[PDB]
Coordinates of C-alpha atoms and ligand atoms in Angstrom, one line a residue:
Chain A
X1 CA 77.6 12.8 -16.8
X2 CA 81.6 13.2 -16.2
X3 CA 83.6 14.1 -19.8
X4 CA 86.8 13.8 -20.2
X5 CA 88.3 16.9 -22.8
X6 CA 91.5 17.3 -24.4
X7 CA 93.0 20.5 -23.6
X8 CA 96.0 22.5 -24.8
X9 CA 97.8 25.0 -23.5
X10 CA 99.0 27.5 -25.5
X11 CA 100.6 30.0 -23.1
X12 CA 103.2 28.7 -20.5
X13 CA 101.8 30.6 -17.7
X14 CA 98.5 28.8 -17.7
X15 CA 98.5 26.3 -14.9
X16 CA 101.1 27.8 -13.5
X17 CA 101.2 31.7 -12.5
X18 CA 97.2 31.7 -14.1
X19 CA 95.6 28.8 -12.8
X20 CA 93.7 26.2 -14.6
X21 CA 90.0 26.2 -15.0
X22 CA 88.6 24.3 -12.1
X23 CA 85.1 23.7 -10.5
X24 CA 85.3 25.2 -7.3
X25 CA 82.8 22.3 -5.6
X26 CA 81.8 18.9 -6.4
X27 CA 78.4 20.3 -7.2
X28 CA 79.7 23.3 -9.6
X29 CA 77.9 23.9 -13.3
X30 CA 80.7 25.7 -14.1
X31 CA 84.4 26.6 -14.3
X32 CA 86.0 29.9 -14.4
X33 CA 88.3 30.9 -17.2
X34 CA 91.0 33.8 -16.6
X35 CA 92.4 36.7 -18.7
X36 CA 96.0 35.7 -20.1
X37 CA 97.6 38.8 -20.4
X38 CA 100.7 40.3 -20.0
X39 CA 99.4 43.4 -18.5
X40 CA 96.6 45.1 -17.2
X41 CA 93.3 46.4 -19.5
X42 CA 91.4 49.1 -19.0
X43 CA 88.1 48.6 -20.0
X44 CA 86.1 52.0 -20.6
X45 CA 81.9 51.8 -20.1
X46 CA 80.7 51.0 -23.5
X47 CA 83.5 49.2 -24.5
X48 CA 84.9 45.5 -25.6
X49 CA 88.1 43.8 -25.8
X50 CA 88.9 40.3 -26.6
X51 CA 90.9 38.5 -23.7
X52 CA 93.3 35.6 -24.7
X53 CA 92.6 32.5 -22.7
X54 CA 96.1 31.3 -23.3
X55 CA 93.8 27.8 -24.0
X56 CA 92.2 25.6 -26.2
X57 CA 89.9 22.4 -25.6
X58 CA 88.8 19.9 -28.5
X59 CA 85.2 18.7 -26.8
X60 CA 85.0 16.1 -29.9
X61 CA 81.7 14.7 -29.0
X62 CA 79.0 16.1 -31.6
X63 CA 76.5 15.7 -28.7
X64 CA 77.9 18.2 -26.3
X65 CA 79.2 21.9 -26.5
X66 CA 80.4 24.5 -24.2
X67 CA 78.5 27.6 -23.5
X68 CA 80.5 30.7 -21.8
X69 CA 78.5 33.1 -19.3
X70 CA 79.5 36.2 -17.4
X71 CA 80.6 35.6 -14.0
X72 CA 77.4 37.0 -11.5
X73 CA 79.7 39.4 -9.4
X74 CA 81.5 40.9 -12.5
X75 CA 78.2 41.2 -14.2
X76 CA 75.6 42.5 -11.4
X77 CA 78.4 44.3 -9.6
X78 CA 80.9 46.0 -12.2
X79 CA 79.1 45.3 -15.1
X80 CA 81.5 43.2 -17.0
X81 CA 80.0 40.6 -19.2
X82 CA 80.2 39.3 -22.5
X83 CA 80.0 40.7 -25.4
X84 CA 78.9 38.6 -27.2
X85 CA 76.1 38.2 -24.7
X86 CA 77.2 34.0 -24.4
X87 CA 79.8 32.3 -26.0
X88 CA 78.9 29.3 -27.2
X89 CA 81.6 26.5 -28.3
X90 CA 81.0 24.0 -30.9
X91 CA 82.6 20.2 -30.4
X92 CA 84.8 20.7 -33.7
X93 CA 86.6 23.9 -32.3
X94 CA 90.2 23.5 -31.4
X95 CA 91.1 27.2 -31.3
X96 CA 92.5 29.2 -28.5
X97 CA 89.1 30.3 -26.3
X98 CA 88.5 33.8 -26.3
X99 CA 86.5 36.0 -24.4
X100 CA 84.6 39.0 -25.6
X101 CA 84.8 41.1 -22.8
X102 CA 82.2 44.1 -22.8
X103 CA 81.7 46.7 -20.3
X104 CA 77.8 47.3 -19.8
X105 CA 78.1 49.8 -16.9
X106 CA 78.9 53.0 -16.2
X107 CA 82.5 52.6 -14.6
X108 CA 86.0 52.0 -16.2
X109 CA 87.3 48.3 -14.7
X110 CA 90.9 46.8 -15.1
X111 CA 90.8 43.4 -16.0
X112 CA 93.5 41.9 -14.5
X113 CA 96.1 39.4 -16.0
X114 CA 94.9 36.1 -14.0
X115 CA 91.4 37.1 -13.1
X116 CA 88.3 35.1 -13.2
X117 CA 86.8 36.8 -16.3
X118 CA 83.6 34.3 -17.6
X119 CA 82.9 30.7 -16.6
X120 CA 82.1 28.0 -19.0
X121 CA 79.3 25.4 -19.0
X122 CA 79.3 21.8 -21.0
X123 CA 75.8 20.8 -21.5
X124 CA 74.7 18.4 -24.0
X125 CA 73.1 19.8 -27.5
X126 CA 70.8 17.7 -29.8
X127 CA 71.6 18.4 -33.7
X128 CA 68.0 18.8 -35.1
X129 CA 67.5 17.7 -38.8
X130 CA 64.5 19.7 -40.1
X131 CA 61.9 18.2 -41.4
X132 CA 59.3 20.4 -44.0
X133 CA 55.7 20.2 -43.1
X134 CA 52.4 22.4 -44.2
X135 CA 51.1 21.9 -41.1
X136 CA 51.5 21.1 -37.5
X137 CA 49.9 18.4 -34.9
X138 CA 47.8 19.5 -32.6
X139 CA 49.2 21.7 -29.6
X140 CA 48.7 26.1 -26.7
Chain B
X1 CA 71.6 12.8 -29.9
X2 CA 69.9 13.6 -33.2
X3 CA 66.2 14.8 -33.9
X4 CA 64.4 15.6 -36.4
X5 CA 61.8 19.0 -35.8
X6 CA 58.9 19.5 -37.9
X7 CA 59.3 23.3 -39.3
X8 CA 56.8 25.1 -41.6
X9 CA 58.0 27.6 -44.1
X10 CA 56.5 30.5 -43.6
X11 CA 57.9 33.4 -46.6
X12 CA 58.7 31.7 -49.7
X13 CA 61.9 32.7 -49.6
X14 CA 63.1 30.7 -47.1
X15 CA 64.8 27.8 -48.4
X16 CA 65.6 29.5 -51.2
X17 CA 66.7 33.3 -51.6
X18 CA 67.2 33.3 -47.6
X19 CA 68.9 29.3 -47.0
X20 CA 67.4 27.7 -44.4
X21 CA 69.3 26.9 -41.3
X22 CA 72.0 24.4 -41.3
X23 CA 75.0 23.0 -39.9
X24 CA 78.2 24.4 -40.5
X25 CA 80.1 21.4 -39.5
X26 CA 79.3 18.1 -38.7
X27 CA 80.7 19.5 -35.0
X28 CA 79.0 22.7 -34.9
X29 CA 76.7 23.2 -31.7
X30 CA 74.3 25.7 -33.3
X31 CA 72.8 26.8 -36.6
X32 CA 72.4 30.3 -38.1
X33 CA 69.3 32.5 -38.1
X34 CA 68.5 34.6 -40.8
X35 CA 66.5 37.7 -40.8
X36 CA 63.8 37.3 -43.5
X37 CA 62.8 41.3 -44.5
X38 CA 61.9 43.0 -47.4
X39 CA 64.7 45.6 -47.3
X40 CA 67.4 46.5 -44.8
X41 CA 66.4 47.9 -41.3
X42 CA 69.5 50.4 -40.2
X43 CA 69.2 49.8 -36.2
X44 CA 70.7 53.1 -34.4
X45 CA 72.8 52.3 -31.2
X46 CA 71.2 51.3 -28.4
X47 CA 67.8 50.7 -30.7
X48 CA 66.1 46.8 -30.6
X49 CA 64.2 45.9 -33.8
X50 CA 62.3 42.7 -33.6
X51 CA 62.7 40.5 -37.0
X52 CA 61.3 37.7 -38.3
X53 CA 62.9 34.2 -39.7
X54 CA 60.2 33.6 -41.8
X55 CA 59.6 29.5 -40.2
X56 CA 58.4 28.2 -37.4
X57 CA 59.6 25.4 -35.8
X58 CA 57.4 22.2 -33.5
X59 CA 60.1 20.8 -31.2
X60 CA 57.1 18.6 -29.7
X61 CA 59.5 16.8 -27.0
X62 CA 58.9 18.6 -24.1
X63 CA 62.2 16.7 -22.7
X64 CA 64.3 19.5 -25.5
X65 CA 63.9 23.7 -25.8
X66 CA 66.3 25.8 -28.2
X67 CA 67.8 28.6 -27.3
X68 CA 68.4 31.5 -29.7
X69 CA 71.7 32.9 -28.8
X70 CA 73.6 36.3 -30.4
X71 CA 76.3 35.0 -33.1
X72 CA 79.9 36.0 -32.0
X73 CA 81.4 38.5 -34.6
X74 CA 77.9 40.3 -34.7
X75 CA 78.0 40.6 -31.0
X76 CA 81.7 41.1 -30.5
X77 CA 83.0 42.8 -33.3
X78 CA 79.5 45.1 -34.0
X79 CA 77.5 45.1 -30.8
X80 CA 74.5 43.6 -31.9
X81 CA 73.1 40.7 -30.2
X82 CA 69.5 40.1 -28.9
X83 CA 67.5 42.8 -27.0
X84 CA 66.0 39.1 -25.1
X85 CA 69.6 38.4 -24.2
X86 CA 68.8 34.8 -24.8
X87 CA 66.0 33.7 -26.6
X88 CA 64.4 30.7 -25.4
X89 CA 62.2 28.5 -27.7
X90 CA 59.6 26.0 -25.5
X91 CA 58.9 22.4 -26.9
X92 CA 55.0 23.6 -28.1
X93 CA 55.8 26.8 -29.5
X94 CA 54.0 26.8 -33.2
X95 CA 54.5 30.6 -34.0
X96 CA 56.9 31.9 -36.0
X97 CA 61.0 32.9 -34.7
X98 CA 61.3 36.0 -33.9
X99 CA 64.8 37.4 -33.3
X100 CA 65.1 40.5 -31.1
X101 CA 68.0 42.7 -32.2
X102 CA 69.5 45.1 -30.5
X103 CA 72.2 47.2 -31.1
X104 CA 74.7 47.4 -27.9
X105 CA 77.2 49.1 -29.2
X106 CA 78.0 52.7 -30.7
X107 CA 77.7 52.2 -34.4
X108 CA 74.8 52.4 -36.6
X109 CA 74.3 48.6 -38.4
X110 CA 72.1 47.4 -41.3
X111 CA 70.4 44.4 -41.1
X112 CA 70.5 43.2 -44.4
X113 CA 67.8 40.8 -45.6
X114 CA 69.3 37.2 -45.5
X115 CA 72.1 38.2 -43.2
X116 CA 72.9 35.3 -40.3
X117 CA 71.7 37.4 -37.1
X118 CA 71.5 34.6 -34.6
X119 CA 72.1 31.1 -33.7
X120 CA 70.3 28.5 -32.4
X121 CA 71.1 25.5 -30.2
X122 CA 68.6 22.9 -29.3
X123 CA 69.7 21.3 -25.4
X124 CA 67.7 19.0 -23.6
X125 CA 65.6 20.0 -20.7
X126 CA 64.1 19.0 -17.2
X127 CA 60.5 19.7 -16.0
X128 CA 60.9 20.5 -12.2
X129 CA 58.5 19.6 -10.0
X130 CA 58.9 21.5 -6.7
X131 CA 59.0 19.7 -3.4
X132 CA 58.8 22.5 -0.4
X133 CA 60.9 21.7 2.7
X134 CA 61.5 23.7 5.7
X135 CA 65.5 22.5 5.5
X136 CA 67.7 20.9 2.8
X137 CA 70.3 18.0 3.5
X138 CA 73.8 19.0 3.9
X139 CA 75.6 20.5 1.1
X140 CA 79.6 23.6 0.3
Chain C
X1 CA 63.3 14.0 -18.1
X2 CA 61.9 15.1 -14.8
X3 CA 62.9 16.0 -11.7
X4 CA 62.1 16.9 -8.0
X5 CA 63.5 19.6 -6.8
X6 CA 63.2 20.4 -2.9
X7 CA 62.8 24.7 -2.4
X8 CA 62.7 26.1 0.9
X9 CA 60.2 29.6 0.9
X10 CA 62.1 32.2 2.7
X11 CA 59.3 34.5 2.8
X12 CA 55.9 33.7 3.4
X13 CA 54.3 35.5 0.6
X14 CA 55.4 33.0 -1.6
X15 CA 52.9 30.9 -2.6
X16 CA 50.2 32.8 -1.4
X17 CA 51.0 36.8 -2.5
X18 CA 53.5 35.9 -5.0
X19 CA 52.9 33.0 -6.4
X20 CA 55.9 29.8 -6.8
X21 CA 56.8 29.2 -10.3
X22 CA 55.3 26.9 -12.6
X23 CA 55.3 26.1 -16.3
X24 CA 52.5 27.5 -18.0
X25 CA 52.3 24.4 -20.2
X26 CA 53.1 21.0 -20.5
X27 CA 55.6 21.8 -23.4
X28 CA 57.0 24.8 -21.4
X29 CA 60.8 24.9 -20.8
X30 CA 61.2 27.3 -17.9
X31 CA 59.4 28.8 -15.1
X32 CA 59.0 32.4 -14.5
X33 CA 60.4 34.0 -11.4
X34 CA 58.9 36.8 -9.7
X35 CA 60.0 39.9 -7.4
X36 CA 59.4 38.7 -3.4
X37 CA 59.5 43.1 -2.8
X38 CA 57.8 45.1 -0.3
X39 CA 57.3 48.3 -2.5
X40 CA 57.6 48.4 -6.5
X41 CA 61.3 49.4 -7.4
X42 CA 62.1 52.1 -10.2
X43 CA 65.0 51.2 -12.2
X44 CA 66.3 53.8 -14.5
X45 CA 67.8 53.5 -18.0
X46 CA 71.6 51.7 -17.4
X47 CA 70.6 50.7 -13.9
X48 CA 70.8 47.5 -12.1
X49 CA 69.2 46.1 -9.0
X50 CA 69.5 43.0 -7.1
X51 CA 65.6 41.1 -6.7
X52 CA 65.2 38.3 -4.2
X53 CA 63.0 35.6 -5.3
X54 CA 61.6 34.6 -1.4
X55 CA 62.9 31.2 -2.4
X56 CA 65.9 28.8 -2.7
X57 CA 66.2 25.4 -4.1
X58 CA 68.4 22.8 -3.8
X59 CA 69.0 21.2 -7.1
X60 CA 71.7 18.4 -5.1
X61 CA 71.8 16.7 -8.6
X62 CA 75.5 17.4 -10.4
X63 CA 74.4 16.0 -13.4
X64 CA 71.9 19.3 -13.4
X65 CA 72.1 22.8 -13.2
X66 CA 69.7 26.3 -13.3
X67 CA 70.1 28.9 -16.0
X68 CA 68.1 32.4 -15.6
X69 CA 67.3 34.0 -18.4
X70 CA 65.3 37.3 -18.9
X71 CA 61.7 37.4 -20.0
X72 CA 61.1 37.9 -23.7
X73 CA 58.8 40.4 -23.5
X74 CA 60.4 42.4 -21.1
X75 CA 63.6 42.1 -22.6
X76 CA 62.4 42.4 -25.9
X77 CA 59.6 45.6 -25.2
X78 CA 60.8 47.2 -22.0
X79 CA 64.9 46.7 -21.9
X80 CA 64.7 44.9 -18.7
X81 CA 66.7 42.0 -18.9
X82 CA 69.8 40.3 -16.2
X83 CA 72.7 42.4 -15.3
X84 CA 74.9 39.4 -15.2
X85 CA 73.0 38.1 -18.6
X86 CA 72.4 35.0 -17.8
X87 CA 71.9 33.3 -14.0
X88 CA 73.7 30.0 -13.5
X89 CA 72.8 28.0 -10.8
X90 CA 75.1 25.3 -8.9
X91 CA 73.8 21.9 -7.9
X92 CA 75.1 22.6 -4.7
X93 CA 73.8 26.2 -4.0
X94 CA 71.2 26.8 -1.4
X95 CA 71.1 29.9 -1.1
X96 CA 68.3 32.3 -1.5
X97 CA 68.0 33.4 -5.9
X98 CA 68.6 36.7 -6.3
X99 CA 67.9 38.2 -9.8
X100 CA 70.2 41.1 -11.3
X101 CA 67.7 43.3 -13.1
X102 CA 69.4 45.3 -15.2
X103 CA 67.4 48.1 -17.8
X104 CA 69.5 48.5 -20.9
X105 CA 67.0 50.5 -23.0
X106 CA 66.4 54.2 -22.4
X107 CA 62.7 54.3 -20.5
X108 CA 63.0 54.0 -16.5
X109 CA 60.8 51.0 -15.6
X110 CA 58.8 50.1 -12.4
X111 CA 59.5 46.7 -10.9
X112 CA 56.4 45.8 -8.7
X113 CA 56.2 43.2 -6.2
X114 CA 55.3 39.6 -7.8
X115 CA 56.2 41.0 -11.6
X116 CA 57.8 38.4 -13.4
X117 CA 60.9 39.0 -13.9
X118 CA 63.5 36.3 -15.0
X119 CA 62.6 33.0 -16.1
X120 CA 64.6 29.6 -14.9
X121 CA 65.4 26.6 -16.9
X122 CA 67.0 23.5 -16.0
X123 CA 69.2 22.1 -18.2
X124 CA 71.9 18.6 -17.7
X125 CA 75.0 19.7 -17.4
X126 CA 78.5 18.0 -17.4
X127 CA 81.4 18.3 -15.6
X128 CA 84.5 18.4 -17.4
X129 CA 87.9 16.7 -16.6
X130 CA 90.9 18.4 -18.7
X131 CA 93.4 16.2 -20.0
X132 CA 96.2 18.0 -21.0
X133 CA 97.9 17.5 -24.9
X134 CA 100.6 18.6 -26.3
X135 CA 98.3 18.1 -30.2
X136 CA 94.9 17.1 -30.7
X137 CA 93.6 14.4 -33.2
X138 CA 92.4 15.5 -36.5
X139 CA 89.1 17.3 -37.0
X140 CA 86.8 21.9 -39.5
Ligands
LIG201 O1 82.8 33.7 -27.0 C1 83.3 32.9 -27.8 C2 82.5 32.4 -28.8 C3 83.1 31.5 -29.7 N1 84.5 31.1 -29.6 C4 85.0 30.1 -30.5 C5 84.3 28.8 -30.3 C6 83.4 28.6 -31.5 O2 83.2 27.2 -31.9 C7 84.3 29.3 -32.6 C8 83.5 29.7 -33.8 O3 82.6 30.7 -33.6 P1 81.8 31.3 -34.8 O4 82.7 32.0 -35.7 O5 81.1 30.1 -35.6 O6 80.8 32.1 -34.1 O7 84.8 30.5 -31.9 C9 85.2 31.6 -28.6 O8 86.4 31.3 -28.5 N2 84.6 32.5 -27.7
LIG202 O1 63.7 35.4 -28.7 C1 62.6 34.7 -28.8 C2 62.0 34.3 -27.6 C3 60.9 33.6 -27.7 N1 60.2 33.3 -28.9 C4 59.0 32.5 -29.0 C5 59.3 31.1 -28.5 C6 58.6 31.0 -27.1 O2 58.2 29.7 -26.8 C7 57.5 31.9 -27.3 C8 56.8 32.4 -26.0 O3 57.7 33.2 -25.4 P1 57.1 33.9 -24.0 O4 56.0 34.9 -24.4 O5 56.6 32.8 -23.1 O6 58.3 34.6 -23.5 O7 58.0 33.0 -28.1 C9 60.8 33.8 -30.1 O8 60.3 33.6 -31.2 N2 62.0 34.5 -30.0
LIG203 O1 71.8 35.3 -11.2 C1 72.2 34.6 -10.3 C2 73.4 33.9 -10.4 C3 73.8 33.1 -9.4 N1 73.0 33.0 -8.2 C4 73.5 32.1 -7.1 C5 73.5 30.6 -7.7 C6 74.9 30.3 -7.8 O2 75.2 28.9 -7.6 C7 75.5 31.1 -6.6 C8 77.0 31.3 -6.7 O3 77.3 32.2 -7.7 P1 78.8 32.6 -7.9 O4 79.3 33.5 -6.8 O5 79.7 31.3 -7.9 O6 78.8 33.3 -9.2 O7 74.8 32.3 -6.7 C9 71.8 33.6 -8.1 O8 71.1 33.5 -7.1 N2 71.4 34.4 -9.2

């Protein structure tokens, strides 16, 4: 499935000196969002700071949502995830995306203004309605 | 889509002194977890405490999982997320939720009875049936 | 939904030794992943360590993707969950899976050969095209 989302840029820079998200292949889950700052950060181990996007999407569809994810070098290599663990973005939210930015390792990093920070996933979600029962079918 | 689960009540109070999950909006990607306990549990840094929801859910399809995900201010602002990461729930799982806490961060946090400690978003899944091949076509 | 999914075995233990994932049940939504080592690996408290897998697939599909999760139990009991959090995998990656294990609780832990040690899911995902606004329509 292909999904056309509004986006809005909120800080001048992005797709311009920071690039736009893009999916690096044709076969790419994801795309990679980047720190819009005006400087540098420091990020001590143990710590977390929240990293403007300079962006905001409207996904509008009740049947789809975003999910955010470390990127695999960051995270195995530095140890610069989330923290928030995954970021998950409902279809109603037209804010500017943020990243929680937590350092789970043992060595200070700079985030960078510009650089690939988290990637970001649309998968579809299923809204459940629960429905009370005293007991289950059958099932394990 | 839209689907109704079968969930059993579990503790009394759910549904009533602890509100059962819903919906924020009629946008929103996930609903809210909360811990159903007797009295608070204070979880020390670094400490993973394993709390129950008081329900169980039947998702049945095995086309659809959930995944139980750490909510955003908990995780960002107070370092507690889930000691699982990512809590994934299979389509014939009849026992109770169980939410693994874990504290992240460097402050001391009480889980209070009834507090929202996760979320919970219900995606669609594929069965994979593995098909073993000395080489793959060309892909990138 | 189902899906084939063609897997090259890079090591020959795989499927005999170590056994190739499968779902434990009918209703199961992801597949475990074991460690394709020599000798059992001791990870320390705060430590991470990349784990091949002896395999790679080739998902070729764009409409699907791979996410790796950690184990509940290990995550949950033993603090050994994915120094990157959560493994996304591309449509078009063939490469061999490698698993970040990452111990985030306090008691040094002993990876053996053909532990399980990461489970997979496949989940739809979309591909998103960003169409740029100066305001978005009304919605929360
Ligand atoms: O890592 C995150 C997680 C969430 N959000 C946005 C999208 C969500 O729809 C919105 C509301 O989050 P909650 O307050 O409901 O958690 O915050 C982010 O920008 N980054
Ligand atoms: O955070 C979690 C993760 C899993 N489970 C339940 C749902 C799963 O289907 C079931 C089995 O998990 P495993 O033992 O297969 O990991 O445990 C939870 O209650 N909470
Ligand atoms: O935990 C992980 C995460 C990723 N990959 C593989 C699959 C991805 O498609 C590929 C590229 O990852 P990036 O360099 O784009 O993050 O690495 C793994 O083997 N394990």
């Amino acid at each position: 499935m292909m999904k056309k989302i509004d986006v809005k840029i909120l800080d001048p820079r992005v797709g311009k000196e920071f690039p736009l998200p893009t999916y690096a292949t044709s076969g790419s889950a994801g795309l990679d969002l980047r720190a819009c700052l005006n400087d540098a950060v420091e990020l001590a181990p143990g710590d977390t700071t929240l990293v403007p996007t300079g962006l905001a999407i409207h996904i509008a569809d009740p049947s789809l949502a975003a999910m955010m994810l470390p990127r695999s070098g960051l995270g195995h290599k530095h140890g610069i995830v989330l923290g928030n663990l995954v970021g998950l973005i409902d279809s109603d939210y037209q804010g500017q995306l943020m990243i929680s930015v937590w350092n789970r390792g043992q060595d200070s990093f700079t985030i960078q203004p510009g650089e690939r920070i988290a990637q970001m996933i649309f998968v579809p979600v299923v809204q459940a309605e629960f429905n009370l029962v005293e007991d289950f079918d059958a099932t394990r």
